[PDB]
Coordinates of C-alpha atoms and ligand atoms in Angstrom, one line a residue:
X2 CA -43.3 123.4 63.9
X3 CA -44.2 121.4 66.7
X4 CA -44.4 117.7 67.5
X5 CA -46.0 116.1 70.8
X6 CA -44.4 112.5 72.6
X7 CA -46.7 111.4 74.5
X8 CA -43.8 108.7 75.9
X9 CA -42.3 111.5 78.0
X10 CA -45.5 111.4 79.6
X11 CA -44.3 108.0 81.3
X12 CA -41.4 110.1 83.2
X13 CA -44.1 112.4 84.8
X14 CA -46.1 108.9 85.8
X15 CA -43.8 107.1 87.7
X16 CA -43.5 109.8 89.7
X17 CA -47.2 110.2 90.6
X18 CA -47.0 113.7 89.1
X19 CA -48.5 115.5 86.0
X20 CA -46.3 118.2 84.2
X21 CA -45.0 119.5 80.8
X22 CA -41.3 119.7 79.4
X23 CA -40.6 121.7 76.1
X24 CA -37.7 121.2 73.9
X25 CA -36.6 123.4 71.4
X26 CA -33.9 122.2 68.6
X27 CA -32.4 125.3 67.2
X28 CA -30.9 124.1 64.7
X29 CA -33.7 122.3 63.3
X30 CA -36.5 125.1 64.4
X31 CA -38.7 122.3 65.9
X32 CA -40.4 121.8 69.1
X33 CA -41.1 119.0 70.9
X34 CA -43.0 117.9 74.1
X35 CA -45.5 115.8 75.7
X36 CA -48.5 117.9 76.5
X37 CA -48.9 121.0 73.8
X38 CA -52.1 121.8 75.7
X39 CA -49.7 122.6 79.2
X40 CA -46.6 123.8 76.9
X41 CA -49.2 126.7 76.3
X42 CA -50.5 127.1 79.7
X43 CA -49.6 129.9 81.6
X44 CA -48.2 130.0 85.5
X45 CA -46.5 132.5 87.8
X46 CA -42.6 132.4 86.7
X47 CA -41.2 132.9 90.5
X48 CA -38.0 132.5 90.9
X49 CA -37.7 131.5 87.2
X50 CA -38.2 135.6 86.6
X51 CA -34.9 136.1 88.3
X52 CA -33.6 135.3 84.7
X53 CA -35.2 139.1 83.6
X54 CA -35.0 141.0 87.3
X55 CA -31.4 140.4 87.4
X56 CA -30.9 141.8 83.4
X57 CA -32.9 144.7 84.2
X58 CA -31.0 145.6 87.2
X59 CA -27.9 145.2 85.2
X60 CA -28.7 147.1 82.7
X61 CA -30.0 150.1 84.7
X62 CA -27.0 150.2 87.1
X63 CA -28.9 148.7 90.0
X64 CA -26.2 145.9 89.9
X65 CA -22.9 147.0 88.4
X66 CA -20.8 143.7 88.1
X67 CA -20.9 139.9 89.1
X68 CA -18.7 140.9 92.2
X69 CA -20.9 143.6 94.1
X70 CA -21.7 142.1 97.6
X71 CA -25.7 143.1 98.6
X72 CA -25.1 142.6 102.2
X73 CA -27.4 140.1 104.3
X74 CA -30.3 142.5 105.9
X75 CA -29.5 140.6 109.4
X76 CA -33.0 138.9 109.0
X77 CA -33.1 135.4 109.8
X78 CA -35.1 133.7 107.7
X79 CA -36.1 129.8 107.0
X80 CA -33.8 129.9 104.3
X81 CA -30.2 129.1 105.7
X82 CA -28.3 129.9 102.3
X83 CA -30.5 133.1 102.0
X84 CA -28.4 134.1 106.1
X85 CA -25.5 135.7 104.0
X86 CA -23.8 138.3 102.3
X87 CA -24.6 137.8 98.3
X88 CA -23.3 138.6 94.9
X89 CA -25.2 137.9 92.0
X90 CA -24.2 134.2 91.1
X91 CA -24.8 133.3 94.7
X92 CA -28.1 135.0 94.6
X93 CA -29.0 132.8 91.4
X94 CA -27.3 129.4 92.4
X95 CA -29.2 129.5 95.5
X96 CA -32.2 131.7 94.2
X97 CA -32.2 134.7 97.4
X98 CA -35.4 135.7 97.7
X99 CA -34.4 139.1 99.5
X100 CA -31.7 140.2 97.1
X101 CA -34.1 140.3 94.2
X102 CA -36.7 141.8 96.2
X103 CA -34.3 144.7 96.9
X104 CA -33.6 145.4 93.2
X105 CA -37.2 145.0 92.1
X106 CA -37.9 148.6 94.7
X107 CA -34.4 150.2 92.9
X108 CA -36.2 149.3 89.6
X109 CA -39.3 150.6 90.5
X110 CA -42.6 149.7 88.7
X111 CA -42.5 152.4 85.4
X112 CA -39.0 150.8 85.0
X113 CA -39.9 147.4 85.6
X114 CA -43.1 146.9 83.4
X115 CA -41.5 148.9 80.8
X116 CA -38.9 146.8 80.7
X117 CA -41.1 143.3 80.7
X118 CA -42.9 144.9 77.6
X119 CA -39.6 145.4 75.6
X120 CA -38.8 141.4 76.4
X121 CA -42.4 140.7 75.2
X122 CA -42.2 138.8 78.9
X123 CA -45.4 136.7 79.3
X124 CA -48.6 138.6 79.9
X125 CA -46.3 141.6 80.6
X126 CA -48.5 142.5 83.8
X127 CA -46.9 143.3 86.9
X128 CA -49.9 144.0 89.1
X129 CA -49.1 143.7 92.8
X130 CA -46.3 144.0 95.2
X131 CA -43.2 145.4 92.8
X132 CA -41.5 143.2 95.2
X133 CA -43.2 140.1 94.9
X134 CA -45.6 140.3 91.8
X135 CA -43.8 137.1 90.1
X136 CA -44.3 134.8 93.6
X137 CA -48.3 136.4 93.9
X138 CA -49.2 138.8 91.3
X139 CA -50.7 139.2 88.1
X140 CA -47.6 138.3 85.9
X141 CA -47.8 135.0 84.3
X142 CA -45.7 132.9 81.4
X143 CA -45.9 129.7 79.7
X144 CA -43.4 127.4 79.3
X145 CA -43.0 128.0 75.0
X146 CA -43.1 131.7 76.3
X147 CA -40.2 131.2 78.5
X148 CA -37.9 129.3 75.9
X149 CA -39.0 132.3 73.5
X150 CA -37.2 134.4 75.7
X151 CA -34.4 132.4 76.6
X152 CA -33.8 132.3 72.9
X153 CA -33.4 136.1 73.1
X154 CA -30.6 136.0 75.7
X155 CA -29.1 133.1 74.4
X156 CA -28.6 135.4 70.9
X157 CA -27.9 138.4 73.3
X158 CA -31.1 140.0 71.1
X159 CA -33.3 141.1 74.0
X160 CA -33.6 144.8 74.5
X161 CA -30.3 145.7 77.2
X162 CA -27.2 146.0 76.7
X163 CA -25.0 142.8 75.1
X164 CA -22.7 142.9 78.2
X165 CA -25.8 142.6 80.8
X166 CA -27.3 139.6 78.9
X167 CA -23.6 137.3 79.3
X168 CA -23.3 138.4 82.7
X169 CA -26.7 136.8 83.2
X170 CA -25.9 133.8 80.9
X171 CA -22.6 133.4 83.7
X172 CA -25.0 133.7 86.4
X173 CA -27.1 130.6 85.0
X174 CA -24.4 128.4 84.6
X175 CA -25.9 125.5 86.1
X176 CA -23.3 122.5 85.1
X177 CA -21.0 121.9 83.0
X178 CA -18.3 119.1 81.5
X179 CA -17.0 117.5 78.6
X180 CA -20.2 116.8 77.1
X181 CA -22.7 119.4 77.9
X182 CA -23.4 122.5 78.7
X183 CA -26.6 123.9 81.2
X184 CA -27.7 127.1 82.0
X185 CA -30.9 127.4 83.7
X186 CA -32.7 128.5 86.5
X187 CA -35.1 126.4 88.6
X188 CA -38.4 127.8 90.0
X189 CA -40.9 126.9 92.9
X190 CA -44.4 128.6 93.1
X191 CA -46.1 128.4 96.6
X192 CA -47.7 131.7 96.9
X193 CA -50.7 130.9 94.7
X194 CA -52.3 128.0 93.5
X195 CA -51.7 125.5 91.9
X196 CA -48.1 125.2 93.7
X197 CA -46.0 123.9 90.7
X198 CA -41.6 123.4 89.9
X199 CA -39.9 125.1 87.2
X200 CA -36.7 124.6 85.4
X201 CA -35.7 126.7 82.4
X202 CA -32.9 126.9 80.1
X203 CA -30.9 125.4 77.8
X204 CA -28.0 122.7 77.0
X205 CA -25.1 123.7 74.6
X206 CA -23.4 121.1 72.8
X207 CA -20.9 121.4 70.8
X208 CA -23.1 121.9 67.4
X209 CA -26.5 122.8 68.6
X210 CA -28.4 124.1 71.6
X211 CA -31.4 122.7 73.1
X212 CA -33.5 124.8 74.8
X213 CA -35.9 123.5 77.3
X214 CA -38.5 124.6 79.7
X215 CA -40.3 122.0 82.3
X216 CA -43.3 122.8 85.0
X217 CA -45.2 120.6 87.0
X218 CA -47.2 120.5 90.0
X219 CA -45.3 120.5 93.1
X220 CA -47.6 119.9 96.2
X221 CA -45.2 119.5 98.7
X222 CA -41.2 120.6 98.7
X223 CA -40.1 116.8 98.8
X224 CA -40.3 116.3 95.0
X225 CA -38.0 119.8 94.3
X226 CA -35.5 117.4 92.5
X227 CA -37.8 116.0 90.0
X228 CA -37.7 119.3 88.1
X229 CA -34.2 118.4 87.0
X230 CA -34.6 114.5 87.0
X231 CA -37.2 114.5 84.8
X232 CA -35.9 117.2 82.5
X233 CA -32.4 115.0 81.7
X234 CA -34.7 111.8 82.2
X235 CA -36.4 113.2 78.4
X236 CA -33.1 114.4 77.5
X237 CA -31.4 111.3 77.8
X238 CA -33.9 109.4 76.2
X239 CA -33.4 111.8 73.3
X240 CA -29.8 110.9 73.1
X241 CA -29.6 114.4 73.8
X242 CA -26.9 114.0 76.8
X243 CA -25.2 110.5 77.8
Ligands
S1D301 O1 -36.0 126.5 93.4 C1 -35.1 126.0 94.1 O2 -34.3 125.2 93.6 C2 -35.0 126.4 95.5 C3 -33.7 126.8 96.0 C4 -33.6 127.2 97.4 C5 -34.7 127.1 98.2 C6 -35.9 126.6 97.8 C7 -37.1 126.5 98.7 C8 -37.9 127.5 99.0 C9 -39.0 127.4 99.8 C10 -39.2 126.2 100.4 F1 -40.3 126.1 101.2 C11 -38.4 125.1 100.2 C12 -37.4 125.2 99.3 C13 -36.0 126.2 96.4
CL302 CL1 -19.8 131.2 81.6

């Protein structure tokens, strides 16, 4: 079942902002957040959907391993990080546009929507560019939608093969130390109004997992960092981390 804390909505306040975060204990099967009504809501995923591009290209060969170098396209672009040769945890950590553009053409749309359908991905609707439908096309997800799959990978249970889904759940490893666990992937949605932040995943502890998924509107690129302050802001007041 589900529960809503209205105090998280203090975190989103001081801030000057208005957003959503989802929990999810596992253990316990119960949700929690601060606005059910936006928990619901669905948005473009952006970069978010690298979380599914980058199992689909796995798992049809379009990347074979963690290692394979997708070579910068000599492009400058205003992305200084995005300047550079690539594998596919650098790709993630600093979410490379180009690179995922690249295997969304080797997917190819048949492959790709058929794929989003099997991981009962959002609205499954990949109308537009197939290399750019998640930044300004038809797809969208919500944020319960998005922990509903992350609880599929987490379980390896979505529809590719086992050994795609941990080299995806490498690629998310966010941080880690002797307390906790993340793996996640941040988002930022320009293209299309409302401009909003992501940031998906979840936090392993040592006896339960606690899966999480945050949006809220992002006007400008100066509050990029709330998507993660927030987040361990609610965790923390949880006595979910230190
Ligand atoms: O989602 C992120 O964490 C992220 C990572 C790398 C770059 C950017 C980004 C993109 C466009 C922009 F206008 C400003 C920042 C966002
Ligand atoms: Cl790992």
């Amino acid at each position: 079942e589900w529960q809503e804390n209205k105090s998280w909505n203090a975190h989103f306040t001081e801030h000057k902002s208005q957003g959503v975060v989802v929990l999810w204990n596992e253990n316990k099967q119960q949700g929690f957040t601060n606005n059910l009504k936006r928990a619901n809501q669905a948005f473009l995923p952006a970069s978010t959907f690298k979380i599914p591009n980058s199992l689909i290209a796995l798992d049809l060969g379009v990347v074979k391993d963690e290692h394979q170098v997708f070579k910068w396209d000599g492009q400058t672009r205003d992305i200084a990080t995005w300047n550079r040769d690539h594998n596919l945890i650098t790709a993630m950590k600093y979410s490379v546009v180009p690179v995922y553009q690249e295997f969304a053409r080797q997917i190819g749309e048949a492959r790709m929507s058929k794929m989003l359908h099997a991981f009962d991905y959002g609205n499954e609707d990949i109308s537009g560019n197939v290399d750019s439908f998640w930044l300004d096309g038809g797809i969208r997800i919500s944020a319960t939608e998005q922990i509903s799959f992350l609880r599929k990978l987490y379980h390896n249970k979505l529809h590719v093969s086992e050994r795609s889904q941990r080299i995806v759940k490498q690629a998310m490893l966010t941080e880690a130390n002797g307390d906790y666990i993340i793996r996640a992937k941040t988002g930022y949605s320009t293209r299309i109004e409302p401009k909003i932040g992501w940031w998906v995943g979840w936090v392993e502890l040592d006896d339960n997992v606690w899966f999480f998924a945050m949006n809220m509107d992002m006007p400008t690129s100066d509050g990029l960092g709330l998507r993660q302050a927030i987040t361990k802001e609610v965790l923390k007041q949880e006595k979910i981390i230190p």
